């Protein structure tokens, strides 16, 4: 990556945060820290979260989500390229009226993924936990998109690819950024 | 080597290097560079030098959409090779300012992917990749002046063009002559 100061740090000075990879704990810790840092520099001005991510860890994504909702500034979300799984969840979590995607960006929604191996009882615990996680995701997505929980449940049952326009129709974003 | 590494020095002259496989890291970097350059000067041309075999379609579209969004013209210059998404990006430069060097190689083809699982999952993956292809083809049609039908036929398999051929096709405007 070229220097102008690496390009991402230069963008951070303009209150732009890049979520440009798989979401794991390191990525979440970095984005959380950036969000808090920006709020401390200025609690009124908008922050811009640029998203090009296939998703990843749900708990890591929720660290980001909760941090966004906690701080005072509006966090705009802009999907460039791809927002899948938790990435699309985060796209939808931007300030109402300030969730965007570029025209050819791809938005994908689906149910959470996991695994469990061991005793019947262990599998039961893991199953209950992942089902509770899904209900939590769905409930929030319902509130943020205006769709019913039942519709979200059905539409996330399998991989569901949306165009930017479709994501807007669904209520995951507010506007498709159109070039002049 | 250092003069400031060579790429950073070129970035000061508004030159962006797309010199590798296109994955998400590369696209994030190029997007960021494009936006940074527009913020420094919204009127001067940007120069995107391309030597790339292609790569991720979504990553390429991040670059594509960013190019179309910003106010400055983005010139494209194919040096060496522009294949798949690389050639798509070459074609996406500002009209009149898409170039290739005389011995540069341009290749066009259909998108690649994979799918594993239940019939239903395969169906979803198939629908998605077909929709992606139609979108690529339509854009290429608009940018080259060729019909959608001709693009469909000509991208069915790997199709290698010379720089001169790429110009005749409408993928670039000029072959840079020494």
């Amino acid at each position: 990556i070229p220097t102008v100061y690496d390009i991402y740090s230069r963008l951070l000075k303009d209150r732009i945060i890049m979520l440009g990879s798989q979401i794991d704990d390191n990525v979440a810790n970095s984005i959380v820290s950036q969000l808090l840092f920006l709020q401390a520099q200025d609690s009124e001005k908008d922050i811009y979260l640029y998203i090009n991510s296939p998703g990843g860890s749900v708990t890591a994504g929720f660290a980001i989500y909760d941090t966004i909702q906690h701080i005072k500034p509006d966090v705009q979300t802009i999907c460039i390229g791809m927002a899948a799984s938790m990435g699309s969840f985060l796209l939808a979590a931007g300030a109402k009226g300030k969730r965007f995607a570029l025209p050819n960006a791809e938005v994908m929604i689906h149910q959470p993924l996991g695994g469990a191996q061991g005793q019947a009882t262990e599998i039961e615990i893991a199953a209950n936990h992942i089902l509770k996680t899904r209900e939590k995701l769905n409930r929030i997505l319902s509130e943020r998109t205006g769709q019913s929980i039942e519709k979200i449940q059905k539409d996330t049952d399998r991989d569901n690819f949306l165009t930017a326009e479709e994501a807007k129709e669904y209520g995951l974003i507010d506007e498709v950024m159109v070039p002049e | 080597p250092t003069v400031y590494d060579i790429y950073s020095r070129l970035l000061k002259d508004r030159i962006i290097m797309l010199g590798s496989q296109i994955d998400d890291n590369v696209a994030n970097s190029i997007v960021s560079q494009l936006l940074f350059l527009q913020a420094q000067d919204s009127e001067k041309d940007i120069y995107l030098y391309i030597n790339s075999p292609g790569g991720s379609v979504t990553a390429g579209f991040a670059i594509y959409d960013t190019i179309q969004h910003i106010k400055p013209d983005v010139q494209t210059i194919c040096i060496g090779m522009a294949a798949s998404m690389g050639s798509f990006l070459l074609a996406a430069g500002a009209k009149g300012k898409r170039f290739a060097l005389p011995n540069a190689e341009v290749m066009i083809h259909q998108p690649l992917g994979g799918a594993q699982g239940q019939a239903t999952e395969i169906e979803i993956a198939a629908n998605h990749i077909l929709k992606t292809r139609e979108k690529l083809n339509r854009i290429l049609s608009e940018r080259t002046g060729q019909s959608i039908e001709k693009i469909q036929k000509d991208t069915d398999r790997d199709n290698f063009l010379t720089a001169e051929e790429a110009k005749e096709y409408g993928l670039i405007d000029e072959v840079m002559v020494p």
Partner: peptide, 6 residues
């Protein structure tokens, strides 16, 4: 991406 983000 300005206007408006930023």
């Amino acid at each position: 991406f300005s206007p408006x983000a930023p």
